[PDB]
Short mmCIF file of C-alpha atoms and ligand atoms in Angstrom, two decimals:
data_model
loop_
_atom_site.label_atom_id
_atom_site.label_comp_id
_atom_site.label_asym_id
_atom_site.label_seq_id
_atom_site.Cartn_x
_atom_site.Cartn_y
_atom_site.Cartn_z
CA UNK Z 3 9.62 -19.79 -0.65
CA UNK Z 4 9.77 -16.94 -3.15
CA UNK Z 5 7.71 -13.28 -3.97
CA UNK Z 6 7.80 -11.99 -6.74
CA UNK Z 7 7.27 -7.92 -6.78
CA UNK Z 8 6.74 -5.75 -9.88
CA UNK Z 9 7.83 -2.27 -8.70
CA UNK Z 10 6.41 0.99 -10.63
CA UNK Z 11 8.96 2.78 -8.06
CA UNK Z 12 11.24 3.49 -10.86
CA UNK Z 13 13.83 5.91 -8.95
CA UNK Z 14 16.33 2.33 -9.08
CA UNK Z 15 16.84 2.93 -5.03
CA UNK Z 16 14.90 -0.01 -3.14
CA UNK Z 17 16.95 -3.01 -4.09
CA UNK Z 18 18.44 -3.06 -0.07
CA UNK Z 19 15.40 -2.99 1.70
CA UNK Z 20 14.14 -6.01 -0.37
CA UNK Z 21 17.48 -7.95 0.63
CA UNK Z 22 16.43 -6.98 4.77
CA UNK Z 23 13.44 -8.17 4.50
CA UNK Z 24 15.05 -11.68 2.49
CA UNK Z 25 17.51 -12.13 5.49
CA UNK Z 26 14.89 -11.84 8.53
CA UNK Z 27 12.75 -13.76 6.32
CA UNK Z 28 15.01 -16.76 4.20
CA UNK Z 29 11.86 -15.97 1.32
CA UNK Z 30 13.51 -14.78 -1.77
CA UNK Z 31 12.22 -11.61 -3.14
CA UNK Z 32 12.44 -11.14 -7.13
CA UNK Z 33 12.01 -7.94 -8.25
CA UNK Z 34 11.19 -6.19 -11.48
CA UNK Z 35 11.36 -2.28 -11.29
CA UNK Z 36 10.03 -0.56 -14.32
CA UNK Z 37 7.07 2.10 -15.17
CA UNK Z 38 3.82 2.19 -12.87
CA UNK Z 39 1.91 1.70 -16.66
CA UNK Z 40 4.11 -0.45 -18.16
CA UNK Z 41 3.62 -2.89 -15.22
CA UNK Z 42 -0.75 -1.96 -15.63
CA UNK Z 43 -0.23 -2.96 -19.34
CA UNK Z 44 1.73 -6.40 -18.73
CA UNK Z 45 -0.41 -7.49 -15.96
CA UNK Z 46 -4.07 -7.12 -18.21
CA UNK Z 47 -2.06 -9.09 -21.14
CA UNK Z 48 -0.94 -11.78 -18.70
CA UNK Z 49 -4.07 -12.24 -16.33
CA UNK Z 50 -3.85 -15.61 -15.17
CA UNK Z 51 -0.33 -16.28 -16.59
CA UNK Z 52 1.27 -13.43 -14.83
CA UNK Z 53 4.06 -14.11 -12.29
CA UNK Z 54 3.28 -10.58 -9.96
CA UNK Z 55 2.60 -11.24 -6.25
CA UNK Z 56 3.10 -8.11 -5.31
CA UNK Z 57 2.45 -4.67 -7.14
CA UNK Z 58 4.09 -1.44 -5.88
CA UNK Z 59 2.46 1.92 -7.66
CA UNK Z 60 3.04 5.64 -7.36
CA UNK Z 61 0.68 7.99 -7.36
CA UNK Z 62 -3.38 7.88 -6.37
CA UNK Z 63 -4.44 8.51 -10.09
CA UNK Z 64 -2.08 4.93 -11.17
CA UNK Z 65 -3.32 2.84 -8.08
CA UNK Z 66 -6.93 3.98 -9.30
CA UNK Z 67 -5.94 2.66 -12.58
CA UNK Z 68 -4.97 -0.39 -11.47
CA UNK Z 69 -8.03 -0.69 -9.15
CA UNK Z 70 -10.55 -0.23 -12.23
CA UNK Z 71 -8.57 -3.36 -13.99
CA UNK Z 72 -9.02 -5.19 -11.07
CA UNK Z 73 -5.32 -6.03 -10.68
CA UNK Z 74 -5.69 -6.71 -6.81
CA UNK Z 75 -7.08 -9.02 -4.49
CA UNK Z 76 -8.70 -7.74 -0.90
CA UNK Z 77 -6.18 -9.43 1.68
CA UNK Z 78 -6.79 -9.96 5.76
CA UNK Z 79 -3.81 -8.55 7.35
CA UNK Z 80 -4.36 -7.40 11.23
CA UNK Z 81 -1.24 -5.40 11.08
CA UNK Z 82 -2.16 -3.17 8.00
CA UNK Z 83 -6.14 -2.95 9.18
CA UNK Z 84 -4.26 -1.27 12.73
CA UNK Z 85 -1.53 0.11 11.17
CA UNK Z 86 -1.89 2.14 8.19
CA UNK Z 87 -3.71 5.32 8.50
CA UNK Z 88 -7.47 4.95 6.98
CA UNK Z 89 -6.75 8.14 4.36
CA UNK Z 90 -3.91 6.47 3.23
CA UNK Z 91 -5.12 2.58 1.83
CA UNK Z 92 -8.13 1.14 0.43
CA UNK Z 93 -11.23 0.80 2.23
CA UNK Z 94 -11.81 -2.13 0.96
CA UNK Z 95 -7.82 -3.40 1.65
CA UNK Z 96 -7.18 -4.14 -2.01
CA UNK Z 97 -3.93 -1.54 -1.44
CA UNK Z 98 -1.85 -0.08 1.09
CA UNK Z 99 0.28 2.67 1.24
CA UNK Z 100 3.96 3.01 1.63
CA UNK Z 101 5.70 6.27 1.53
CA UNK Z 102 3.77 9.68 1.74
CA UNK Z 103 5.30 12.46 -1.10
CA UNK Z 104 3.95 16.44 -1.32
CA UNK Z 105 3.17 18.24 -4.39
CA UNK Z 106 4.53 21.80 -3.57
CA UNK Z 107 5.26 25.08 -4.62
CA UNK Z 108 8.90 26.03 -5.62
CA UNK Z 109 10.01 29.48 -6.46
CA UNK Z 110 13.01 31.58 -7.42
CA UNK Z 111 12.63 34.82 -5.04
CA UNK Z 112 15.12 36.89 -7.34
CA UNK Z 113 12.08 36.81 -9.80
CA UNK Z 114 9.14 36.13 -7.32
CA UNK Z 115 7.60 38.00 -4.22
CA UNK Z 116 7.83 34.28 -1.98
CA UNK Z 117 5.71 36.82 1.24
CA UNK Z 118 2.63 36.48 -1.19
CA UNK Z 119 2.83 32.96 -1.67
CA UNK Z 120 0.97 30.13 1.04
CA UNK Z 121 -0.90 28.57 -0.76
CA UNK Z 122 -2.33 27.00 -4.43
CA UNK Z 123 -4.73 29.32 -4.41
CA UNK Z 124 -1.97 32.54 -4.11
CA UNK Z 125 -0.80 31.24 -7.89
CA UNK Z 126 -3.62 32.88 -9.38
CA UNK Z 127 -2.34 36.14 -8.48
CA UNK Z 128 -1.73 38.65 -11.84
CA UNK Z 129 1.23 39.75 -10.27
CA UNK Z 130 2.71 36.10 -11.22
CA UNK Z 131 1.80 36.46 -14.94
CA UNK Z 132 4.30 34.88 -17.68
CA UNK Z 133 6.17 33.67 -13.95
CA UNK Z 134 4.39 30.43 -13.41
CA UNK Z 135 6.02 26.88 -15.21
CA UNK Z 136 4.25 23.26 -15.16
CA UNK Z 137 4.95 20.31 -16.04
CA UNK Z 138 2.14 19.02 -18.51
CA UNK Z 139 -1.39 17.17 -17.36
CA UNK Z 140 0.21 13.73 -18.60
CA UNK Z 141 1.52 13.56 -14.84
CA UNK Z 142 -0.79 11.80 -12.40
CA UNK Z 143 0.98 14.09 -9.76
CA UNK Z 144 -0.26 16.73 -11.66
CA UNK Z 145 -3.45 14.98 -12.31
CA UNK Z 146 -3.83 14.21 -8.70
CA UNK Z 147 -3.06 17.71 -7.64
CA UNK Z 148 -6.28 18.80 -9.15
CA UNK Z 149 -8.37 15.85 -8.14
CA UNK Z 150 -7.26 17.03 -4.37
CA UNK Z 151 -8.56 20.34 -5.46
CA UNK Z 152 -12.03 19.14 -6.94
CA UNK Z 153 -12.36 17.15 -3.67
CA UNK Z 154 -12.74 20.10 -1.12
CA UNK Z 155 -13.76 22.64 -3.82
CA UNK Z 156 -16.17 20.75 -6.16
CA UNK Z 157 -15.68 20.95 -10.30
CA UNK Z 158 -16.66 24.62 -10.23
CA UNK Z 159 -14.44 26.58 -7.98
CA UNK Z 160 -11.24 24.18 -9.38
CA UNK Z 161 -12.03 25.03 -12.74
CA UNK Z 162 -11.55 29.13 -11.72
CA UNK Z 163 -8.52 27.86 -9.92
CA UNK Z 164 -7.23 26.58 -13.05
CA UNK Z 165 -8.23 29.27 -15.53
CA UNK Z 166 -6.44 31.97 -12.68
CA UNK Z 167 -3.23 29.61 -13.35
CA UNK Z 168 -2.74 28.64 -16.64
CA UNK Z 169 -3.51 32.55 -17.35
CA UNK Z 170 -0.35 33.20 -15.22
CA UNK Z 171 2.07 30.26 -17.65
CA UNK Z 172 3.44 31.95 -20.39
CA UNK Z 173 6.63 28.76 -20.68
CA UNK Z 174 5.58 25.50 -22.69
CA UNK Z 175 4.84 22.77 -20.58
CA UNK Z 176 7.43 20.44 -18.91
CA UNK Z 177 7.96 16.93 -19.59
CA UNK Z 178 9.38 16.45 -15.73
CA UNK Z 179 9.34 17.84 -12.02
CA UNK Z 180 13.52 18.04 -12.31
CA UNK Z 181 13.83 19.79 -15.86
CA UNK Z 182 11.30 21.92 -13.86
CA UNK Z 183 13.55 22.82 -10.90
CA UNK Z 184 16.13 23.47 -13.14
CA UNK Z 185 13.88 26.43 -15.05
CA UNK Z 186 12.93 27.69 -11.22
CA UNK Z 187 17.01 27.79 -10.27
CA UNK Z 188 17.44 29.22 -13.50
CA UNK Z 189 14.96 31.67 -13.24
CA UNK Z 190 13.38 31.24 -16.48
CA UNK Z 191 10.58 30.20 -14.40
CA UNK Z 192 9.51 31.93 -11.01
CA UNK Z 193 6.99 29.41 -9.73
CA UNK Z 194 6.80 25.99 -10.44
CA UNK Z 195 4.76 23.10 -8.81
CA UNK Z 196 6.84 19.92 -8.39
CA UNK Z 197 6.82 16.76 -5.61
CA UNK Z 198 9.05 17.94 -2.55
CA UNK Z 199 11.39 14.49 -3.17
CA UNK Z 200 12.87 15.92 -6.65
CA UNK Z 201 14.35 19.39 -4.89
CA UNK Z 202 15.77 17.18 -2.07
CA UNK Z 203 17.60 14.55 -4.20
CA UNK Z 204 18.85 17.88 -6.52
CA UNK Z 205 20.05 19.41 -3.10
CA UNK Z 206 22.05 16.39 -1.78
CA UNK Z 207 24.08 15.92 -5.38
CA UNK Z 208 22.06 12.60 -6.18
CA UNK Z 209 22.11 14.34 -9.82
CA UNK Z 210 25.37 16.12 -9.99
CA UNK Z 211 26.74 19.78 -9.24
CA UNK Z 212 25.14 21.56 -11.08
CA UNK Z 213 21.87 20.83 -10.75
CA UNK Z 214 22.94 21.12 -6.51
CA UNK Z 215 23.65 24.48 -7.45
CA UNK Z 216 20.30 25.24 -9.45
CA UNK Z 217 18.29 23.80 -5.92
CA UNK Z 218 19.79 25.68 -3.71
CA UNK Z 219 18.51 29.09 -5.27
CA UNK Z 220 14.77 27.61 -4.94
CA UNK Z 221 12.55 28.74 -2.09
CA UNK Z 222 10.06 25.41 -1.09
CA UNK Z 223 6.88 26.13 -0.26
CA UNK Z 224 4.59 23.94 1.69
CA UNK Z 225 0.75 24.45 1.38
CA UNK Z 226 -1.07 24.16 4.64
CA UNK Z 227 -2.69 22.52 4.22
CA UNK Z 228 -0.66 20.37 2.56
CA UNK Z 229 -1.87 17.63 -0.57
CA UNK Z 230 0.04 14.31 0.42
CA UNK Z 231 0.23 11.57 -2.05
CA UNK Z 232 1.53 8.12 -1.84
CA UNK Z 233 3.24 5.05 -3.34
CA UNK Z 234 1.18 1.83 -2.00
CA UNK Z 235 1.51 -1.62 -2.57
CA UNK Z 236 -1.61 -4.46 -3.00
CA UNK Z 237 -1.72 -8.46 -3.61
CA UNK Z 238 -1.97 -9.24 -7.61
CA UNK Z 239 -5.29 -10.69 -7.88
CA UNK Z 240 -3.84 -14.13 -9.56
CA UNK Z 241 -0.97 -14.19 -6.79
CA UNK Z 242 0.72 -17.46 -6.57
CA UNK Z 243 2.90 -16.34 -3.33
CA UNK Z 244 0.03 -14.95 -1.69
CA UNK Z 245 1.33 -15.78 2.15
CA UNK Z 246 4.59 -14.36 1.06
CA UNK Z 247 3.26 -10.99 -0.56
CA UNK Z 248 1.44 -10.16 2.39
CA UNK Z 249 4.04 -10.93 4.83
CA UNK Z 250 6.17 -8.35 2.30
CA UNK Z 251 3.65 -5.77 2.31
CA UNK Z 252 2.93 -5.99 5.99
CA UNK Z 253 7.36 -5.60 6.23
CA UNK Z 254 7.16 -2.19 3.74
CA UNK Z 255 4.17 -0.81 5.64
CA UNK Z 256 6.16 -1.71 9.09
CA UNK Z 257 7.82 1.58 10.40
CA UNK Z 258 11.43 -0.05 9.42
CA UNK Z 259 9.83 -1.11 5.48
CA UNK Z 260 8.56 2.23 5.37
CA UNK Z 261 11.71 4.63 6.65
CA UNK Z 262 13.80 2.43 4.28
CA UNK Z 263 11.56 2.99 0.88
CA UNK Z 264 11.50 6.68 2.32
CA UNK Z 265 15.12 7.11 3.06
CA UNK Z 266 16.17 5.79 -0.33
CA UNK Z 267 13.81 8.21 -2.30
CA UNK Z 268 13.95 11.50 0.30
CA UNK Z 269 9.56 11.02 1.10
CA UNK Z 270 8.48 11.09 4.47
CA UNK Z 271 7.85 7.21 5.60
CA UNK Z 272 3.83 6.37 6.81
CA UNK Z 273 3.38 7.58 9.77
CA UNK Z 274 6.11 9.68 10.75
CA UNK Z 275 7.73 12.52 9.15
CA UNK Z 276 11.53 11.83 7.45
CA UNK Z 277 14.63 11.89 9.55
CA UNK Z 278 16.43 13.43 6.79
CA UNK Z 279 17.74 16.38 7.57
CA UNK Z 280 17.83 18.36 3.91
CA UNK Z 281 13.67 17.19 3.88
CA UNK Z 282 13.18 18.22 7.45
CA UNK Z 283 14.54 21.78 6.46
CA UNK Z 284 11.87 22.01 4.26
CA UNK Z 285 9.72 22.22 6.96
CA UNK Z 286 6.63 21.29 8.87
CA UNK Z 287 3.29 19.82 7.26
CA UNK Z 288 -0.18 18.87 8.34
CA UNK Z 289 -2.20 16.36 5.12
CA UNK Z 290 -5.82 18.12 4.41
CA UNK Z 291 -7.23 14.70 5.00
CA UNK Z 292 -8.35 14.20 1.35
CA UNK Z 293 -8.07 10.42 1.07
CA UNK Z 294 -5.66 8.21 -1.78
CA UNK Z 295 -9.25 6.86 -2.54
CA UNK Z 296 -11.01 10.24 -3.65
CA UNK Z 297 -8.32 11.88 -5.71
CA UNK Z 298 -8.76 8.38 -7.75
CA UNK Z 299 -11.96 9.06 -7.79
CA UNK Z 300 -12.21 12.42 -9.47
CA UNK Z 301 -9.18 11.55 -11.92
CA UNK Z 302 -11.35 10.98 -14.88
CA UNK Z 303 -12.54 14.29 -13.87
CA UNK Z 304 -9.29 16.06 -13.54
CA UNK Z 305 -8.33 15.26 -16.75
CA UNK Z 306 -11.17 16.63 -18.18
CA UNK Z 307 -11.20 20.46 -16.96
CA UNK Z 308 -7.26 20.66 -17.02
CA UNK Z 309 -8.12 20.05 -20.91
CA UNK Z 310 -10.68 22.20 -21.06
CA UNK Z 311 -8.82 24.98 -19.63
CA UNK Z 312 -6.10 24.31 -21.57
CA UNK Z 313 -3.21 22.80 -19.19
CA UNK Z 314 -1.31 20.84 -21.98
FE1 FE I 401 8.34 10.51 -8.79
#
């Protein structure tokens, strides 16, 4: 009894909760960690012939992706039905998620006024111009990020959103969330928007000493409320090891599956928020209730008015 599990958590920390599960369990897990699109790409080439089971994604605008190509089967699980919150998996239980991560506001408050700043909305202040950095619209969590925002607002209000920011970003864009954090420490940049897991693996030396030393000069902010996104898992639509994927998913989604993905990668697990005490300092959140489902829906959408307005 085997599962095989092609991972698009790329961060090269999960290996140990795999082996738990494979020792309560006697089925041996192979896994294959690699990019979220590289795994999309394989699995449409390999249809039939693929050897997934299970397929682990990050981000809402990637699972959507891999929802459109019809890469997962619905499953019956009674645990996941009861289990995961509704906002966070598929209503029609093709996917589940995993871990919860926040897109959030970091600043340097040597160069920024951090009392004028709650909210996405506060970034469209002119007192910010030439202060604000991104990372470009290639990101889903970027991508997603505005999705949240068409959600609530509709296409109209998020496109003045986004004309009131990219008027305040005066920096090229960045390829990453860390080179990002970096700028902010630095304080080349004064605002930046970034996922809350990036400061807190900078912060505990996962990346060395000096980019500890560049973290601890940011101030993270925490929208309330806040835009949660997810990593989720589903059943590849071919399977061979259905039984055992599910059994795996229904382990990951389990509050010990989900603390141990979280721990490993500094996001809060499902249902509860992390344990860790450098996340925990970052404070308090409550999720605007936007579900994984609709910021894949309005992807296609994102894309389009963040190249309109000229987020690059
Ligand atoms: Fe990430």
């Amino acid at each position: 009894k085997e599962v095989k599990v092609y991972s698009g958590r790329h961060y090269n920390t999960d290996k140990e909760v795999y082996q738990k599960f494979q020792e309560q369990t006697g089925i041996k897990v192979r896994y294959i960690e690699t990019d979220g699109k590289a795994i999309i790409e394989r699995l449409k080439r390999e249809g039939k012939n693929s050897q997934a089971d299970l397929v682990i994604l990050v981000d809402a605008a990637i699972i959507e992706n891999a929802s459109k190509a019809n890469l997962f089967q619905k499953i019956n699980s009674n645990f996941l039905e009861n289990s995961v919150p509704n906002n966070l998996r598929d209503p029609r239980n093709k996917w589940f998620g995993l871990t919860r991560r926040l897109r959030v506001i970091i600043s340097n408050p040597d160069i920024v006024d951090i009392t004028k700043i709650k909210n996405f909305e506060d970034l469209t202040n002119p007192s910010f111009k030439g202060k604000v950095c991104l990372r470009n619209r290639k990101s889903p969590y970027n991508q997603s990020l505005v999705s949240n925002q068409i959600a609530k607002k509709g296409v109209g209000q998020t496109k003045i959103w986004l004309k009131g920011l990219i008027s305040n970003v005066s920096t090229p864009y960045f390829s990453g969330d860390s080179s990002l954090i970096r700028a902010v420490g630095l304080g080349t940049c004064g605002i930046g928007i970034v996922n809350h897991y990036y400061v807190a693996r900078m912060l505990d030396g996962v990346k060395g000493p000096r980019d500890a030393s560049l973290a601890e000069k940011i101030k993270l902010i925490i929208p309330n409320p806040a835009h949660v996104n997810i990593t989720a898992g589903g059943v590849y639509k071919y399977a061979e090891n259905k039984t055992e994927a599910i059994k795996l998913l229904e382990y990951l989604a389990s509050s010990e599956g989900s603390q141990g993905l979280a721990n490993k990668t500094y996001e809060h697990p499902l249902k509860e928020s992390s344990q860790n005490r450098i996340v925990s300092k970052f404070g308090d959140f409550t999720p605007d209730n936007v579900t994984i489902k609709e910021l894949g829906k309005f992807n296609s959408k994102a894309i389009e008015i963040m190249k309109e307005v000229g987020w690059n």
